[PDB]
Design a protein around this ligand. Structure first.
Ligand SMILES: CCCCCCCCCCCCCC(=O)OC[C@H](COP(=O)(O)OCC(O)COP(=O)(O)OC[C@@H](COC(=O)CCCCCCCCCCCCC)OC(=O)CCCCCCCCCCCCC)OC(=O)CCCCCCCCCCCCC
Ligand SMILES: CCCCCCCCCCCCCC(=O)OC[C@H](COP(=O)(O)OCC(O)COP(=O)(O)OC[C@@H](COC(=O)CCCCCCCCCCCCC)OC(=O)CCCCCCCCCCCCC)OC(=O)CCCCCCCCCCCCC
Ligand code: BCL
Ligand SMILES: CC[C@H]1c2cc3[nH]c4c(c3C)C(=O)[C@H](C(=O)OC)c4c3nc(cc4[nH]c(cc(n2)[C@@H]1C)c(C(C)=O)c4C)[C@@H](C)[C@@H]3CCC(=O)OC/C=C(\C)CCC[C@H](C)CCC[C@H](C)CCCC(C)C
Ligand SMILES: *[C@H]1O[C@H](CO)[C@@H](O[C@@H]2O[C@@H](C)[C@H](O)[C@@H](O)[C@H]2O)[C@H](O)[C@@H]1O[C@H]1O[C@H](C(=O)O)[C@@H](O[C@H]2O[C@H](CO)[C@@H](O)[C@H](O)[C@H]2NC(C)=O)[C@H](OC(C)=O)[C@H]1OC(C)=O
Ligand SMILES: CCCCCC/C=C\CCCCCCCC(=O)O[C@H](COC(=O)CCCCCCCCCCCCCCC)COP(=O)(O)OCCN
Ligand SMILES: COC(C)(C)C/C=C/C(C)=C/C=C/C(C=O)=C/C=C/C(C)=C/C=C/C=C(C)/C=C/C=C(\C)CC/C=C(C)/C=C/C=C(\C)C(=O)O
Ligand SMILES: COC(C)(C)C/C=C/C(C)=C/C=C/C(C=O)=C/C=C/C(C)=C/C=C/C=C(C)/C=C/C=C(\C)CC/C=C(C)/C=C/C=C(\C)C(=O)O
Ligand SMILES: COC(C)(C)C/C=C/C(C)=C/C=C/C(C=O)=C/C=C/C(C)=C/C=C/C=C(C)/C=C/C=C(\C)CC/C=C(C)/C=C/C=C(\C)C(=O)O
Ligand SMILES: COC(C)(C)C/C=C/C(C)=C/C=C/C(C)=C/C=C/C(C)=C/C=C\C=C(C)\C=C\C=C(C)\C=C\C=C(C)\C=C\CC(C)(C)OC
Ligand SMILES: CCCCCCCCCCCCO[C@@H]1O[C@H](CO)[C@@H](O[C@H]2O[C@H](CO)[C@@H](O)[C@H](O)[C@H]2O)[C@H](O)[C@H]1O
Ligand SMILES: [Fe+3]
Lengths: 273, 60, 55, 335, 62, 39, 58, 58, 39, 58, 39, 60, 39, 39, 56, 39, 58, 39
């Protein structure tokens, strides 16, 4: 089916690879060449996840756990029961996430939009690629990746944190947390302002950009404007993921002690050493 | 029977079919290669009298 | 009872009185893991509960 | 291709807004001004603020709360102004000792803490009232004060959960690294907060808030050249920027919002972050005392092979004691 | 007394019932524009059925 | 679009290709069963 | 009974059916393959008298 | 009774109903397959008096 | 939408199919009860 | 009290009622299934005097 | 929107369906009771 | 008293009332079901003399 | 909205239904008390 | 939308494929049953 | 079978096929490279009677 | 797109590249088999 | 065979080829450098008899 | 853009360069095999 205004927009063009061959829709979904590759990697990766569950101890959704190999295998592919299945699924996930980004570019090109969405999603792909590729590769073993399991990856996060005794003291982590918290605040403010001028109390005219700028101005002391709040939201949300990737890649490859003792440089500034 | 190709565009039924077969073939190979009995890269030279067979514990 | 009986005349494994062609292995899920039955079972494997505080 | 990430041409207007919309009681404080730096990223006007009675009292109550915290931090380094700056992130004003329960504690052993907490709480409530009155004066919906009420709810659970377990000692210390020490020790005391399902939900909405604002920020910038940032007019008088935004997400993931309703998705994801959070805190130590064991009971916990096995005499030997009081003497061991 | 049911489990299902109710509400709101859908088989609503298209009143100025 | 004659011509190739592929798979299973039967 | 194909487009029903049967078939095979008794890749050559049986009551 | 199909589009209800019955059947089967007594894949060949039973009062 | 006459025609199929399904499920429960009674 | 169907659209009320009953029945069944006394899939074949009961006052 | 006639006709079916439902529930509860009473 | 329905739309009130009553009923039942004395699903067959009672004054 | 003539008859139903609900709840508490008194 | 003649023509193939599939599945079950019966 | 190119214009799908083959070859080599029997970088000189067999 | 005579000419090269590639692979497999058989 | 250059822009193909071969060369060197037998920066001076070999079949 | 003549000229270079690269790489393998053979 189509939105009442949609049909006019469904032209050919804007593809990156396939030309007209895959330039069609399936229900609501645009396909394209990277749609085909997406569904390939999604299906293969999903069915291998189901196989991992089948050969594991339970079907309980929360307890399924497909673990990476032991560190002794280094950068080789382990036996599939022993973590090689995790390594294949990781390749499928990279293939799927990459295909999804490039498919979004084909869609943006067909609509004459800017490329912002593909790149903003690249911030998440960067963070994933850091956790499963870049950081494991710098540590010299694929076994440093997180396990694929709804709670077992939380056991990994816990243990990686305490590998540095008190992970809250990681300075890039403090920045990343600040971005996540500031983003959620900014999202609530922006959502509230737009809804408050479009849904004023009954018997009140629809509001205006002037009213939301006046309200925003006496909240923060300055008016950010309509383009400004969207630039800020993009900056905060994507900046959180980028600082997240930094905070985890410095932990291990570049810093090995507890994080609290990193702050020794601040105590030793010569003005007060 | 041939009017199935008036219902569906053959250009993309063939894409969906080939992709399904590729995904299926890769799954079955990775499933077999995960098993002990059919881990053929490591044990393919064993004769059938030497190949692994899984059993439950006796627990007598 | 950790392995099935072996036929001395062949070295062949007997399951329920009858031979198997092949090397028998006992099947297990990944790395021998078993799901946790209960809190009581998890706690039964731990130390006893701590003694009261000295105040 | 222009990315619309910063503004190469700003325009000034000599008269200005900042003189509010018709607002009645209270006073507009200061004269509007332009920052060229603010004008690069967003709108350039830095300008007048409204307080009214609730805003004035909120600042008075809040300033006292900030003074009490800072003066106690500064007293804790013996009034040394160098060590005050050098050690600032490790300094705290610390809650009362556990043995008092809910009784009033000595002034230097948590009495200042409860005072600062009281004036901060009153200041936060008066700020909520200030925002509520301002939204109505500008003839707006009440979405913003209810969004802020969700944050206040989570904050209040750092008072109610200590109240429910029966001790002010459990409250959060005022201090940069010290409140992170509390955050870690809370998860330790209650047996790993990852297995608290409302904590898991709160994370799902915190991450979802970043997902939505990244998607929505990027979407509007991607159609901003077609006027897509004029969101109110795209809501009342749908243009091609809205249509393209709907079609992008429809063609990408098979469903779409509207230019209005994406702001409801935004509002609920942010609000549910702190609302589910508060529920998880209130349940901790009152209903569940070990979240990992609650996870085992409800089947959350993935099994791993045993890393050690205890014998029965080790099970008796390796039980400890619960932690008690500190030794209030300096023993001689000489005989 | 109930061994398995506990107050954290009860509260969690109360949230799930609310949350699915919320998703339904949000999906009705998502359908005020562009619906009903055009299709070869005639108009389509999906599920849930969308809320009606909303009219906005502008102000008379001052 | 394509005519019923085109559909019929395509169908003949499509059925033949399917059956040839199934035949090749049959011989692969004959070989695998000879090497290491699964029942 | 053919007027069911007037209420529903056969092109859509066959997509739904192929999707449903594909998922259901893969579900059942993986469930069996996860079991002890029907782990046929490891144990398919055991006879019926030799295959596992889940524990009975005392 | 047939006026219910004037209140509700039968094309929509039939899709809703098949969706409900599919989910419900999968839920009931998975509840039973989780159980001890009706783990029929592992223990379905046990006689009715050999199948597991939950504990009584002492 | 439907006429009342079309609604009446559909109702016949719907009631028959519903009752047919319940009969098939009744035989399924008969077979299941005879294999392993749950009370 | 039929003017309630003038007050509320019966198409919406009847879907509300169906959803309410569906949720409530599922809640009650799963509560009972999580009990000891009424865990009927494991223990439904026990006689009424053999079924579990919670502890008394001492 | 309903006429008051249609409302009053629909109400008759609604009362009848409710009664049929309560009857089935009553039988079900008495089957449950005689198998394992809760008081 | 009936002019209350001129202040308040009864179509809103009846929904708000049903919502309140359903929440309140579920809250009370689950509070009782969580108690010792009234965990009626597991202990409902106990006579009133043998249902649990909270401990009296301990003479501390 | 509504006229006072409509509010008049709605109030009659509303008062009656409220009192009926309180009556049914009164029997439920009578039964609950007879089974297991809370004081 | 399809002519009723086209629906009639499609229904013949749809029944025939369903029957064929059910036959293949029935043989598959009886092979599985002969090798390792689940009851 | 040449009529296949009237469905699938080769200039749009050769880079597809070649990308498929290159990845598939790399996967197969890496699967072999870290098996015990075929880790030829470390053990390629052994000769067949000395090469590992992963017997149970 | 291309004409049929173009498609025939392209197919002639594509088939020959396929045979060439398969021949190199066949020698590669037989070298590998000679070095270290996998059955 | 030269008509392949009428399908594809040589300016882009030569970039794609050089990129591919550069990545491939860099991978093969890293695979060898990470090995035991061919870690030539540390052990390159060892004679071919002295160079490491992986374990045989026991 | 391109022509039969232009394509032929480029193809001559592209084939020559490719073969020249493979020749030099074969000498590197000869040197590597002499230093430390891998089979
Ligand atoms: C889950 C993971 C997480 C992810 C989790 C999230 C998942 C998100 C996805 C969820 C599903 C989305 C479904 C959707 O959007 O459908 C749009 C479509 C459009 O409707 P329409 O526009 O009105 O009609 C279309 C139709 O008329 C024409 O289709 P078209 O010609 O364009 O394309 C053909 C199709 C496939 O064709 C067929 O399936 C029929 C083939 C002939 C069958 C003959 C009988 C066989 C009998 C057996 C004999 C056997 C012996 C011979 O495919 C295409 O060509 C399009 C491209 C497909 C995508 C590219 C694939 C690339 C290759 C990789 C493939 C890998 C394997 C999938 O709708 C419909 O057709 C009706 C609804 C269909 C529902 C399908 C899903 C049902 C699943 C049920 C599961 C229930 C579990 C409880
Ligand atoms: C804890 C914090 C959470 C935080 C995260 C929370 C995430 C919340 C957002 C995601 C959920 C909304 C997704 C959505 O609305 O998609 C549009 C779709 C259909 O759109 P439509 O406009 O109403 O109808 C279109 C149709 O009329 C004409 O389309 P066409 O003819 O071209 O194609 C045929 C349709 C057939 O429909 C389907 O195949 C449905 C596919 C599955 C629907 C969702 C099932 C539940 C989630 C997935 C479970 C399976 C997942 C593996 O084909 C399509 O329309 C395909 C486009 C929709 C694809 C949606 C994919 C969503 C994936 C969500 C993944 C969630 C992962 C957790 O809607 C629906 O089918 C009904 C959705 C109803 C709301 C979902 C919540 C229900 C709560 C339970 C209430 C009681 C039971 C309903
Ligand atoms: C210039 C046009 C032709 C050419 C024309 C000839 C001719 C003519 C002769 C050879 C000969 C040879 N060529 Mg040739 N050859 C070319 C391209 C190549 C390429 C390549 C990668 O493209 C390679 C590997 C070779 C390799 C070879 C050897 C098999 C052989 C002599 C050894 C040699 O390598 O000398 C080093 C050469 C190279 C690495 C590359 C080519 C360098 C130049 C252009 C040619 C040098 C020829 C050499 C001086 C012999 C002179 C013979 C007298 C004039 C009679 N040629 C080009 C495309 N080649 C000779 C032969 O058959 O010997 C048995 C021979 O007589
Ligand atoms: C939906 C959940 C998210 C959320 C939302 C949210 N927060 C909000 C809001 C919303 C919707 C607001 O509207 C409100 C606000 O005002 O935003 C600007 C607020 C707010 N969120 C705040 C913070 C905050 N939010 C956080 C988080 C969150 N906020 C969540 C992620 C966090 C974190 C992550 O830790 C923090 C720290 C504040 C900035 C603000 C509420 C401000 C407030 O209540 O201030 C009270 C006043 C004081 C503490 C005193 C200040 C003292 C002055 C410096 C003294 C100066 C001297 C003075 C003039 C003397 C007096 C003389 C008189 C005569 C005048
Ligand atoms: C000083 O006194 C304190 C308070 O008793 C001791 O700390 C105790 O032990 C710790 C485990 C705990 O953290 C703390 O809460 C507290 O319970 C501290 O170790 C010092 O101990 C010495 O003095 C003790 C004292 O209480 O004065 C003394 O205790 C014994 O003697 C007193 C009378 O003088 C008597 O009231 C106590 O009952 C008695 N207790 C015991 C266990 O004997 C310690 O003597 C001994 C043998 O423990 C002193 O310890 C030493 C080594 O001198
Ligand atoms: C914007 C509004 C959003 C609202 C979302 C609501 C979601 C979550 C919060 C719900 C409140 C949770 C209360 C938790 C406390 C609790 O559970 O304490 C129980 C008693 O039981 C109880 O109090 C029962 C509590 C029932 C809660 C209400 C359920 C009914 C209404 C649902 C409405 C959904 C739609 C809106 C004690 O537990 P225990 O472990 O000590 O018992 C055993 C001791 N040996
Ligand atoms: C772990 O164990 C688990 C995995 C769990 C176990 C379970 C497994 C399961 C459930 C498996 C299910 C498998 C299955 C189910 O159906 C498998 C079904 C497979 C099928 C259908 C295969 C069909 C293949 C068909 C092919 C190859 C066709 C080739 C056609 C060719 C070559 C010609 C094309 C025409 C041309 C070129 C002419 C153009 C002319 C034109 C245009 C003109 O002239 O106009
Ligand atoms: C682990 O245990 C768990 C899983 C939990 C337990 C639970 C299990 C459950 C709940 C299972 C439910 C199963 C189920 C329920 O009904 C299963 C229902 C299955 C069904 C119905 C299968 C039907 C298959 C039909 C087929 C294959 C038809 C093929 C048709 C063909 C080939 C012809 C196509 C048309 C043509 C060619 C005409 C062109 C001409 C045209 C157009 C013209 O000429 O115009
Ligand atoms: C556990 O899993 C694991 C371990 C992985 C196990 C499982 C593995 C599996 C399942 C593997 C499957 C493999 C497979 C399946 O099909 C593999 C299929 C491979 C195939 C198809 C190879 C085909 C290659 C063909 C080639 C190279 C052709 C080249 C042609 C060229 C160069 C000429 C180009 C044209 C010219 C010059 C003319 C221009 C003229 C023009 C334009 C004019 O004249 O106009
Ligand atoms: C001279 O001026 C100077 C220079 C000193 C000014 C400078 C001041 C400085 C440098 C201040 C620095 C402050 C810093 C760094 C503060 C850091 C604060 C942080 C990070 C706080 C984090 C968390 C705190 C929480 C969550 C606290 C919550 C407290 C609550 C909810 C308390 C509630 C208390 C109540 C309601 C009390 C009621 C009173 C009664 C009597 C009822 O008692 C219970
Ligand atoms: C199992 C539970 C068994 C006990 C349940 C008892 C429930 C109560 C039943 C009361 C029956 C009679 O109830 C009575 O109905 C009439 C007619 O509809 C209502 O009458 C109402 O509407 C009429 C017009 O139609 C107005 O003129 C009148 O002022 C108004 O009250 C009364 O408000 C109500 O008191
Ligand atoms: Fe916006």
């Amino acid at each position: 089916a189509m939105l009442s205004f949609e049909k006019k927009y469904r032209v050919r063009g804007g593809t990156l690879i396939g030309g007209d061959l895959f330039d069609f829709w399936f229900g609501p979904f645009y396909v394209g060449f990277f749609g085909v590759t997406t569904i390939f990697f999604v299906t293969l990766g999903t069915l291998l996840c189901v196989w991992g569950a089948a050969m594991g101890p339970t079907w309980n959704l929360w307890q399924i756990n497909i673990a990476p190999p032991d560190l002794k295998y280094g950068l080789g592919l382990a036996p599939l029961r022993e973590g090689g299945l995790w390594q294949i699924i990781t390749l499928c996930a990279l293939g799927a996430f990459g295909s999804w980004a490039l498919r979004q570019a084909e869609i943006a090109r067909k609509l004459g939009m800017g490329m912002h969405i593909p790149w903003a999603y690249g911030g998440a792909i960067l963070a994933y690629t850091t956790l499963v590729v870049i950081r494991p590769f710098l540590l010299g073993a694929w076994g440093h990746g997180f396990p694929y399991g709804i709670f077992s990856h939380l056991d990994w996060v816990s243990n990686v944190g305490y590998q540095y005794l008190h992970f809250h003291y990681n300075p890039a982590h403090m920045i990343a947390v600040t971005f996540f918290f500031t983003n959620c605040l900014a999202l609530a403010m922006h959502g509230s302002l737009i809804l408050s001028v479009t849904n004023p109390p009954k018997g009140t005219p629809t509001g205006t950009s002037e009213q939301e700028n006046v309200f925003f101005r006496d909240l923060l002391g300055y008016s950010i404007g309509a383009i400004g709040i969207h630039r800020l939201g993009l900056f905060l949300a994507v900046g959180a993921a980028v600082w997240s990737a930094i905070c985890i890649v410095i932990s291990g490859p570049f810093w090995t002690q507890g994080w609290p003792e990193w702050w020794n440089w601040w105590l030793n500034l010569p003005i007060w050493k | 029977m041939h009017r199935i190709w008036l219902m569906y565009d053959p250009r993309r039924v063939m894409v969906a079919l080939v992709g399904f077969l590729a995904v299926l073939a890769l799954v079955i190979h990775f499933v077999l290669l995960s098993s002990q009995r059919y881990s053929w890269i490591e044990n393919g030279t064993l004769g059938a009298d030497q190949a692994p067979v899984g059993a439950s514990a006796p627990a007598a | 009872p950790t392995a099935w009986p072996v036929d001395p005349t062949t070295g062949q494994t007997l399951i329920n009185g009858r031979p198997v062609v092949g090397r028998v292995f006992i099947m297990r899920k990944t790395d021998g893991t078993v799901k946790y039955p209960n809190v009581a079972d998890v706690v039964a494997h731990e130390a006893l509960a701590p003694l009261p505080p000295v105040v | 291709e222009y990315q619309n990430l910063f503004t190469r041409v700003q325009v000034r207007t000599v008269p200005e807004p900042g003189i509010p919309i018709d607002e009645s009681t209270g006073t507009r404080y200061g004269t509007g001004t332009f920052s060229y730096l603010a004008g690069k990223f967003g709108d350039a006007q830095i300008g007048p603020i409204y307080l009214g009675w609730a805003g004035v009292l909120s600042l008075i109550f809040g300033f006292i709360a900030i003074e009490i915290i800072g003066l106690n931090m500064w007293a804790s380094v013996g009034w040394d102004p160098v060590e005050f700056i050098r050690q600032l992130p490790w300094l705290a004003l610390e809650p009362p000792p556990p043995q008092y329960g809910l009784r009033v504690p000595p002034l230097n052993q948590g009495g200042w803490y409860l005072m600062a907490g009281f004036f901060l709480t009153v200041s936060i409530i008066l700020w909520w009232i200030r925002i509520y009155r301002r939204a109505r004066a500008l003839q707006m919906g009440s979405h913003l004060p209810w969004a802020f009420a969700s944050a206040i709810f989570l904050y209040s659970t750092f008072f109610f959960q200590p109240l429910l377990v029966g001790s002010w000692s459990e409250m959060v210390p005022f201090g940069i690294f010290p409140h992170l020490d509390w955050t870690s020790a809370f998860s330790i005391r209650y047996g790993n907060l990852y297995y608290n399902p409302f904590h898991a939900l709160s994370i799902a909405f915190l991450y979802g808030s970043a997902v939505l604002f990244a998607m929505h920020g990027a979407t509007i910038l991607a159609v901003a050249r077609m006027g897509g940032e004029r969101e109110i007019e795209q809501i009342t008088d749908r243009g091609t920027a809205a249509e393209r935004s709907m079609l992008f997400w429809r063609w990408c993931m098979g469903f779409n919002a509207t230019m209005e309703s994406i702001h409801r998705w935004a509002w609920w994801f942010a609000v549910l972050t702190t609302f589910t959070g508060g529920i998880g805190i209130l349940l901790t130590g009152t209903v569940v005392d070990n979240w990992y064991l609650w996870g085992v009971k409800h089947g959350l916990v993935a099994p791993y092979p045993a890393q050690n096995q205890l014998t029965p005499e080790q099970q008796d030997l390796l039980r400890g004691r619960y932690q008690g009081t500190a030794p209030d003497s300096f023993p001689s061991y000489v005989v | 007394m109930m061994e398995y049911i506990d107050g954290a489990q009860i509260a969690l299902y109360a949230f799930w019932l609310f949350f699915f109710g919320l998703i339904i509400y949000l999906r009705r709101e998502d359908k005020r524009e562009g619906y009903p859908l055009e299709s070869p088989q005639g108009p389509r609503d999906g599920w849930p059925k969308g809320a009606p298209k909303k009219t906005y009143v502008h102000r008379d100025h001052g | 679009g394509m005519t019923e004659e085109e559909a019929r011509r395509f169908h003949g190739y499509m059925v033949t290709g399917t059956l040839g592929y199934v035949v090749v798979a049959s011989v692969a299973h004959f070989l695998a069963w000879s090497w290491r039967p699964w029942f």
